[PDB]
Design a protein around this ligand. Structure first.
Ligand code: HEA
Ligand code: HEA
Ligand SMILES: [Cu+2]
Ligand SMILES: [Mg+2]
Lengths: 74, 266, 91, 51, 504, 90, 78, 72, 47
C-alpha cells in the first residue's frame, strides 16, 4: 500500500499555500470545461485540490459558484 | 500690574531672549475635553442614544479651548514677547510636528501598498476587485493636481514678497485654491462607484484621502488665521512662515497620495 | 515702547526692494503656468457634476458591502451615498 | 494556509498546547499527536476511514 | 491652582513622577492577582474566569509599560532635569509641556474605566485582531482611545524636548558638553517622533475595522499587516523606555566613582547606533506567523547586531568604575545591580533573536523572563537609582540610608526569585497568557509566587524611607544641578550660566 | 577680544576675551547679582566641564587645575557684545 | 558634532550591511511570485515556475552545501 | 484694568504669601519648602496612605465588579 | 489707538474669552464627564 497526496508545485514557493489551493480548484473546473469530464488530468486536478483545500473553503466556493458570484470565465 | 512689566524686564527680559509664561488654565481643560469627546466617540460607535451629541459637545469644548489658547499666543506675539530666536524655535517645532504627521501618512500608505500588491484568496486574487470601478488619473484628480500645484506656487509667492498688498493677495489666492480642493473632493466622494465598506480598495482610498483632506482643511484654516493677523499690522512673524511650511507639507503629501492611489491603483 | 522684542532687536539683524519683485515674478511664472487652467477646468467641473447617471448594479460579492456589525453609526447606507449600487436582490 | 514539512524519528505520544491568546478558554486547547509505524498506518489505521 | 495651571518644568516633572508612582502602585496591585492565581494548579481566587484573567494581564501590561516607566523617566526626570542640565531658563513651549502631562490622567481614566464596562478588554497589551475585533461592546474602544491619548502625550513631549535641546542651550556649550542623560533624552524624543504615529495609524485602522465595517484586518484584508505596523512601533518603544535609564546610570556611576565617563563619543555613537538599528528589526516578534524564509533570515541576522553597542556601553560603565575612588551608597547599588542584571536580560534576547531557537520558546514564559529582566532590572532599577540620587534636590526631603538598603535588598531578592524560575518553565514549554497549567509546572510557579510577595513587601517598605533633609551651600560640581540649592528657586538659573573656553 | 566672527551677537562677551586669568591679573566676570554660576573647561581636555559659583568681594578663585583665576564684579548692565562694542568698533 | 572615534566605523560596517540587506529585501519583494494582481499570471506554467524557483534559489543556494552537510551548529555535535 | 493685555502677558504682580502658603514659592529661594507646612508629616503620611490605598484597591474593585455581574 | 471692535484680540474682549470661559467650560466639562461615565458604564449598546 502507498498513499498519494498533492505534489509540490514549483509555482508556489511560500509557506502560505492558499494560492496553490485556489489555482488547483480553478484548474479543475477549467479541465472540466475544456477536456471533458472523465479525462485523467481533470481527476488529477480534483484530487490535487481535495488534498490541499479545507472542506469549509471548498463548500464556500461551490456556494459562491451556485449563487453566481464566481469571477472565473468558465 | 504696572510693576509687573517692570518686574519682568528686571528679572527675565533683560537677561535672556527667551519667553517665560504666566500660569495658564487651557491645557487642563483641553485634556478633560479630550476625555469627554473620547467617551462620546465610544458611545457614538455602538449607536447609544445621545452619544454623537456628547462627542460633538466634547469636540466643541476642545475647539473653543484651542482657539482661546491661540488667541493668547497671538496677543503675546503682539506685545513683542517673541524675539528672533523664539521665532526660530517656532519654526523648528513646526518641523518636528510635520515629521510626526509624515510618519503617520507613511503608516497609512504602507497599508495601501501591502493590500494592493498581493490580493488574497478572499478577493479571488484580483486587484482591484471585480465590481469596483477605480478612479482614474486622467480626470478631475488631474485638475486637483494642477490646482494644488498652483496653490504651492502662490504660497511660495507670499513667502518672498515685501509689498503687503501682494502678500495679502497671494495668501487669499492660496486659501481660495485650497477651498476649491475640498469642494471638489466632496464631489468625488459623492459620485464614486464604491463605498468605505466595499473592499480594501474602498477602505484604503477613503481613509487615506479623508486624512489628507482633513489636513488640507486644517492648513487652510491656519493660513486664514495667519492672514487676519497680517491684515491688521502688516507683520506676521512666525505665523506666516510656519503656515506656509505646513501648506508645502500638505502639497508634498498629496504627491505620494496621488502617485500611490490614483496612478498605482493601490 | 520698551518691549523685549525691541530690546533684543539690534542683536538679531535681518539678513540684508527690486530683488523681491524679481523673486515675485519668478514664482508667479510658475503660478500662472498651472493657475488659470486648473481653475477654469474646475469651474467647468462644478457645472458638469451631479447630472450624469450610472445604472451598473454590482452583484453582492462577499467583499462588497461588509456588515460585520448591523448598519452604520449614522444609519443604514453609507455616508455621502445617495444611490447604493450593489444588488440588494440577487437573483 | 501555512504549510509545515515534518518527519518523525520515533514512535510515541507527544503533547502540546495552543500558543496564541484567543479568548477565555485559551488554556484549554491541548494537542496530542500519536506516532505509529508506517506499515501499521497503511494497513490498519487507514482502513478505519474507508467508506 | 499651582499644580493645575503650571508652566514650570520643575512642577510638571514632579507631577509626572507622582503620576508614575500611582501607575506603579496600580500595576503592582494587578500583578499580585496574576501571581496569586498562578501559584497552584487548578482555579484560584479568580474562580475560573479566564476573561477576567485576560483583562487583568492586558491592563497590567499596558499600565506598567505606558503609565509607569515613560512618565517616570521621559516625563519625570527629563522635564525636571533637562533645562537645568543644559542651562536653559525654561522649556521652549511651557504650556505645551502642561498639556503633555494633562492628557495622561484622561488616558488612565479611560483605561481603568474599560475594565468596568461589559466583560473588559481581554486581548493582551498588543491587542491582536480578530480577537480585538470580536469583542462586542465598548471596552476595547476605550482602551484604544487611551492608547491614542498617551501617544499624543508622548509626541507633544518629544517635540518640546527636541526644540528645548536644539535652541535654548547655554552660551558656549556645544553638542559635546551636554551630559549623557541629555543625549539619551534627545535620542528618545527622536525615537518617539519617528515611531508613535505608526501606532496611531494602526489603531485608527483597528477602530475602522471594529466600528465602520471596513476591510483593513478582516476576512478580505490581511491580519499580518497589523503585526507589521504594531511591531514597527513596538520595537522602538522598548528602546524609548531604556535609554533614559542608561543616562541615569551614566550620571550615577560617574558621580560616585569620582571620575568622568569612559569613552564619551563611543557612548554617544553606541546610543545612536541603538536608536538606528531599532527601526529595521521589528519582525523578530513575528517568527511564527508564516513569513518567508528570506525575510526571517534577514530579521535574524540584523537583530543580533544590537548586542555590540550595548556591550560597548556596559564595558564603558565598568571602565568608568575602574581606577576610580568608589563610594557605595543606595543609588550606586541600584546602578551596579542594573549593570549586573541587564546583562542577564540581554543575553536571552540574543537567544530569542535566533529564529530556529525561537520556534521552541515563542509565547512561553522564557520571553516573560527576558522582558522582566530588561524592564524590572533595567528600567525600575534606573528609576529607583534616580529617586535616591536627586531626591533631596527634587522633593526637599532626604532619605534614611538603612531603610533604603533594606528596600533595595528586599526588591533584589524578590524580583530575582520571581523571574529566574520562569526561564525553566519556558524552556520546558509552559505557554504565556494562561491561568491554569499542567501538574508538573507546580514547583517553579510556587517559587515565583513566593518571590512576588517579597517584591510587594519591598514596595511597601519604600514609603518608609523618607525623612527630613539637611541643606548646605554648594561651591563646585561637574553638572549644573549640583551647584544649586536644595530645593532650587522657582526660576532656577536666575542668571544664565555661560561656558568659557580656556585661553592660550 | 577674540575674533567675533561666527559668534552670536547676544552672548555677553568677556567669555571671548584674549586674556588668561592669573593670580595677579584675573578675569573680571560681570554679574547682575552678588553671585553667579560660570563654567570652565579643563585646559588639557575640552570634554571636561566644571561649574563653579563666584561671590562678590572674594579673592581670585581658580576652578580647574592649571586654569584661570576669576573675580566677580557687580554691574547694572552687562555688555551684550556683538552689537555693543563691535558696532562701536574702536 | 564631534570626531568619530575609531570604534564608530567598526560599528558602521555591520550597520551599513544591515541597511543594505534591508533595502535589498524590500526591493526584491515586488519582484516575487505571489505579488501578482491577476489569476492569468499562473496560466503560463513555464514562466511562473521559473520565476518562483528563481525566488527560491537566491539567498538559499549559498546554504545548500552546508544544509546537505548539516552545518547547523558552531561545534560538531555528531 | 484687571483684564488688560499686560495682565495677560506679564501676569498679576502679586507679592508675598499667596493665600494660605507659609512661604513664597514664586520668588523665594526654594520652590518647595516642606519644612514650613504646619503638621507636614501628618499630611504627607495621610496622602501617601491614601495613594497606596487607592492604587492597591482599584483593581480589587474591578475584580469584584466583574464577578458580581456574573453571579446574578 | 491700535484696536478696533472688529479686532479678535481686543483687550475689551479678554474677560469673555479668558475669565468667563474658564468657569463656564470648567463646569460644562464636569457635567459632560459625569454623564459620559454613566452612559458608557450603565448603557446598552444597540450596535
Ligand atoms: C514596566 C514593565 C513591567 C514591570 C515593572 C512588571 C512587573 C511585574 N510583573 Fe509583569 N508584565 C509586563 C510588564 C511589567 N511587569 C508586560 C508588558 C506584560 C504582558 C501582558 C500581556 O501579555 O498582555 C506583563 C505580564 C506579566 C506576567 C505574564 C502573565 C501571563 O503571561 O499570563 C507575569 C507573570 O508572573 C507578571 C508578573 C510581574 C511581577 C510579579 C512584577 C513585579 O516586579 C511587581 C512590580 C514591582 C515593582 C517594584 C515595579 C513597580 C515600580 C515602581 C513602583 C516604580 C515607580 C516609582 C516611582 C516613579 C517613584 N507580569
Ligand atoms: C526594556 C525593554 C527591552 C529591551 C532593552 C530589549 C532588548 C532586546 N530584546 Fe526584547 N522584548 C521586550 C523588551 C525589551 N527587549 C518585550 C516587552 C518583549 C515581548 C513583547 C511582547 O509582549 O510580546 C520582548 C521580546 C523580544 C523578542 C521577540 C521574541 C518573542 O517574543 O518570541 C526578541 C527577538 O529577537 C527580543 C530580543 C532582544 C535583543 C536581541 C535585545 C538587545 O537590545 C539586548 C542586547 C544586550 C545584550 C546582548 C547584553 C549586553 C551585551 C554584552 C555584554 C556583549 C556580549 C554579547 C555578545 C557577545 C552577544 N526580545
Ligand atoms: Cu523587540
Ligand atoms: Mg504569538
Amino acid at each position: 500500500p502507498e498513499l498519494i497526496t498533492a505534489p509540490y508545485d514549483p509555482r508556489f514557493p511560500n509557506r502560505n499555500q492558499a494560492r496553490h489551493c485556489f489555482v488547483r480548484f480553478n484548474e479543475y473546473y477549467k479541465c472540466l470545461y475544456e477536456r471533458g469530464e472523465e479525462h485523467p488530468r481533470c481527476q488529477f486536478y480534483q484530487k490535487a485540490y481535495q488534498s490541499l483545500c479545507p472542506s469549509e473553503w471548498v463548500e464556500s466556493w461551490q456556494e459562491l459558484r451556485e449563487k453566481g458570484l464566481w469571477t472565473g470565465k468558465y | 500690574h504696572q510693576t509687573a512689566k517692570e518686574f519682568y524686564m528686571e528679572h527675565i527680559g533683560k537677561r535672556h531672549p527667551f519667553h517665560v509664561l504666566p500660569p495658564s488654565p487651557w491645557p487642563m481643560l483641553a485634556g478633560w475635553g479630550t476625555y469627554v469627546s473620547c467617551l462620546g466617540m465610544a458611545a457614538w460607535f455602538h449607536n447609544m442614544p445621545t452619544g454623537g451629541a456628547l462627542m460633538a459637545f466634547g469636540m466643541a469644548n476642545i475647539a473653543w479651548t484651542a482657539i482661546t489658547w491661540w488667541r493668547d499666543c497671538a496677543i503675546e506675539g503682539d506685545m513683542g514677547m517673541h524675539t528672533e530666536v523664539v521665532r526660530k524655535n517656532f519654526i523648528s517645532g513646526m518641523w518636528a510636528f510635520i515629521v510626526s504627521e509624515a510618519l503617520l501618512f507613511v503608516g497609512l500608505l504602507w497599508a495601501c501598498l501591502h493590500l494592493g500588491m498581493s490580493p488574497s484568496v478572499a478577493l479571488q486574487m484580483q486587484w482591484p476587485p471585480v465590481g469596483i470601478e477605480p478612479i482614474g488619473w486622467d480626470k478631475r484628480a488631474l485638475v486637483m493636481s494642477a490646482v494644488l500645484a498652483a496653490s504651492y506656487y502662490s504660497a511660495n509667492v507670499a513667502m518672498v514678497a515685501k509689498d503687503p498688498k501682494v502678500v495679502m493677495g497671494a495668501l487669499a489666492t492660496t486659501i481660495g485654491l485650497g477651498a476649491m480642493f475640498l469642494a471638489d473632493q466632496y464631489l468625488e466622494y459623492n459620485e464614486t462607484p464604491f463605498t468605505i465598506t466595499d473592499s480594501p480598495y474602498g477602505t484604503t482610498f477613503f481613509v487615506t484621502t479623508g486624512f489628507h483632506g482633513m489636513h488640507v482643511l486644517l492648513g487652510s484654516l491656519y493660513l486664514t488665521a495667519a492672514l487676519m493677523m497680517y491684515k491688521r499690522t502688516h507683520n506676521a512673524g512666525a505665523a506666516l512662515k510656519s503656515s506656509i511650511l505646513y501648506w508645502h507639507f500638505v502639497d508634498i503629501v498629496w504627491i505620494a497620495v496621488y502617485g500611490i492611489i490614483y496612478v498605482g491603483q493601490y | 515702547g520698551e518691549t523685549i522684542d525691541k530690546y533684543w532687536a539690534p542683536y538679531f539683524p535681518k539678513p540684508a526692494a527690486d530683488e523681491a519683485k524679481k523673486s515675485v515674478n519668478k514664482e508667479m511664472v510658475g503660478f500662472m503656468l498651472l493657475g488659470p487652467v486648473g481653475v477654469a477646468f474646475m469651474l467647468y467641473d462644478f457645472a458638469v457634476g451631479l447630472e450624469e447617471e450610472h445604472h451598473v448594479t454590482i452583484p453582492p460579492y462577499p467583499w462588497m458591502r461588509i456588515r460585520r456589525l448591523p448598519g452604520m453609526p449614522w444609519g443604514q447606507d453609507g455616508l455621502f451615498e445617495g444611490h447604493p449600487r450593489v444588488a440588494t436582490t440577487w437573483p | 494556509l501555512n504549510q509545515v514539512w515534518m518527519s518523525i524519528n520515533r514512535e510515541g505520544v507527544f503533547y502540546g498546547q495552543c500558543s496564541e491568546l484567543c479568548g477565555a478558554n485559551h488554556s484549554f486547547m491541548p494537542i496530542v499527536v500519536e506516532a505509529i509505524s508506517p506499515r501499521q498506518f497503511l494497513t490498519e489505521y487507514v482502513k478505519k476511514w474507508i467508506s | 491652582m499651582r499644580w493645575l495651571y503650571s508652566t514650570s518644568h520643575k512642577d510638571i516633572g514632579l507631577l509626572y513622577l507622582v503620576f508614575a508612582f500611582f501607575g506603579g502602585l496600580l500595576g503592582t496591585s494587578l500583578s499580585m492577582l496574576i501571581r496569586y492565581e498562578l501559584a497552584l494548579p487548578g482555579r484560584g481566587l479568580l474562580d475560573g474566569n479566564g476573561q477576567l484573567y485576560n483583562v487583568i494581564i492586558t491592563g497590567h501590561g499596558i499600565i506598567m509599560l505606558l503609565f509607569m516607566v515613560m512618565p517616570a523617566l521621559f516625563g519625570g526626570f527629563g522635564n525636571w532635569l533637562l533645562p537645568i542640565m543644559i542651562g536653559a531658563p525654561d522649556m521652549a513651549f511651557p504650556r505645551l509641556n502642561n498639556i503633555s502631562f494633562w492628557l495622561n490622567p484622561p488616558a488612565l481614566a479611560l483605561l481603568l474605566l474599560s475594565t468596568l464596562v461589559e466583560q473588559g478588554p481581554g486581548t493582551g497589551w498588543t491587542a491582536y485582531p480578530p480577537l480585538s475585533v470580536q469583542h462586542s461592546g465598548t471596552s476595547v474602544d476605550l482602551a484604544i482611545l487611551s492608547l491614542h491619548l498617551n501617544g499624543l502625550s508622548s509626541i507633544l513631549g518629544a517635540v518640546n524636548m527636541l526644540v528645548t535641546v536644539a535652541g535654548l542651550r547655554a552660551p558656549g556649550m556645544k553638542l559635546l558638553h551636554m551630559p549623557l542623560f541629555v543625549w539619551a533624552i534627545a535620542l528618545t524624543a527622536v525615537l518617539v517622533i519617528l515611531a508613535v504615529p505608526v501606532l496611531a495609524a494602526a489603531l485608527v485602522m483597528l477602530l475602522t475595522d471594529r466600528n465602520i465595517n471596513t476591510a483593513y484586518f478582516c476576512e478580505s484584508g490581511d491580519l499580518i499587516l497589523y503585526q507589521h505596523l504594531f511591531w514597527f512601533f513596538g520595537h522602538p518603544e522598548v528602546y524609548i523606555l531604556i535609554l533614559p535609564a542608561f543616562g541615569i546610570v551614566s550620571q550615577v556611576v560617574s558621580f560616585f566613582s569620582q571620575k568622568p565617563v569612559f569613552g564619551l563619543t563611543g557612548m554617544i555613537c553606541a546610543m545612536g547606533a541603538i536608536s538606528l538599528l531599532g527601526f529595521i528589526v521589528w519582525a523578530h516578534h513575528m517568527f511564527t506567523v508564516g513569513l518567508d524564509l528570506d525575510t526571517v533570515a534577514y530579521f535574524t541576522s540584523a537583530t543580533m547586531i544590537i548586542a555590540v553597542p550595548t556591550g560597548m556601553k556596559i564595558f564603558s560603565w565598568m571602565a568608568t568604575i575602574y581606577s576610580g575612588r568608589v563610594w557605595f551608597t543606595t543609588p550606586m547599588w541600584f546602578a551596579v545591580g542594573f549593570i549586573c542584571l541587564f546583562t542577564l536580560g540581554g543575553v536571552t534576547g540574543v537567544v530569542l533573536a535566533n529564529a530556529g531557537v525561537d520556534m521552541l520558546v515563542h509565547d512561553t514564559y522564557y520571553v516573560v523572563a527576558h522582558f522582566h529582566y530588561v524592564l524590572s532590572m533595567g528600567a525600575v532599577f534606573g528609576i529607583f537609582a534616580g529617586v535616591y540620587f536627586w531626591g533631596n534636590l527634587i522633593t526637599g526631603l532626604g532619605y534614611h540610608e538603612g531603610r533604603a538598603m533594606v528596600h533595595f535588598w528586599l526588591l533584589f531578592i524578590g524580583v530575582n526569585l520571581t523571574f529566574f524560575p520562569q526561564h525553566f518553565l519556558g524552556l520546558a514549554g509552559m505557554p504565556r497568557r494562561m491561568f491554569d497549567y499542567a501538574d508538573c509546572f507546580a514547583g517553579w510557579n510556587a517559587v515565583s509566587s513566593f518571590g512576588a510577595s517579597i517584591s510587594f513587601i519591598s514596595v511597601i517598605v519604600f514609603a518608609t524611607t523618607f525623612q527630613e533633609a539637611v541643606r548646605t551651600v554648594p561651591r563646585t560640581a561637574t553638572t549644573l544641578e549640583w551647584v544649586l540649592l536644595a530645593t532650587p528657586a522657582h526660576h532656577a538659573l536666575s542668571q544664565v550660566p555661560v561656558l568659557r573656553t580656556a585661553s592660550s | 577680544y577674540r575674533p567675533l566672527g561666527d559668534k552670536e551677537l547676544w552672548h555677553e562677551a568677556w567669555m571671548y576675551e584674549d586674556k588668561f586669568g592669573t593670580e595677579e591679573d584675573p578675569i573680571i566676570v560681570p554679574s547682575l547679582e552678588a553671585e553667579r554660576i560660570i563654567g570652565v573647561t579643563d585646559p588639557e581636555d575640552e570634554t571636561l566641564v566644571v561649574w563653579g559659583i563666584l561671590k562678590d568681594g572674594e579673592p581670585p578663585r581658580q576652578f580647574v587645575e592649571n586654569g584661570e583665576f576669576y573675580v566677580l564684579k557687580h554691574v547694572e548692565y552687562i555688555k551684550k557684545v556683538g552689537d555693543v562694542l563691535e558696532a562701536i568698533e574702536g | 558634532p564631534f570626531k568619530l572615534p575609531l570604534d564608530a566605523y567598526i560599528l558602521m560596517l555591520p550597520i551599513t550591511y544591515a541597511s543594505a540587506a534591508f533595502v535589498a529585501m524590500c526591493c526584491r519583494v515586488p519582484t516575487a511570485d505571489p505579488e501578482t494582481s491577476s489569476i492569468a499570471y499562473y496560466e503560463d506554467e513555464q514562466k511562473s515556475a521559473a520565476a518562483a524557483q528563481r525566488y527560491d534559489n537566491s539567498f538559499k543556494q549559498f546554504f545548500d552545501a552546508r544544509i546537505r552537510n548539516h552545518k547547523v551548529g558552531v561545534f560538531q555535535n555528531w | 484694568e484687571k483684564y488688560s493685555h499686560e495682565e495677560v502677558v506679564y501676569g498679576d504682580g502679586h507679592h508675598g504669601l499667596r493665600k494660605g502658603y507659609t512661604y513664597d514659592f514664586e520668588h523665594g529661594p526654594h520652590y518647595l519648602q516642606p519644612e514650613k507646612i504646619p503638621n507636614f508629616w501628618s499630611k504627607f503620611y495621610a496622602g501617601t496612605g491614601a495613594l497606596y490605598a487607592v492604587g492597591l484597591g482599584v483593581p480589587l474593585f474591578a475584580v469584584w465588579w466583574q464577578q458580581s455581574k456574573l453571579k446574578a | 489707538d491700535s484696536y478696533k471692535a472688529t479686532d479678535f484680540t481686543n483687550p475689551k474682549y479678554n474677560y469673555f474669552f479668558r475669565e468667563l470661559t474658564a468657569r463656564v467650560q470648567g463646569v460644562l466639562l464636569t457635567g459632560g464627564s459625569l454623564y459620559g461615565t454613566w452612559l458608557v458604564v450603565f448603557g446598552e449598546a444597540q450596535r
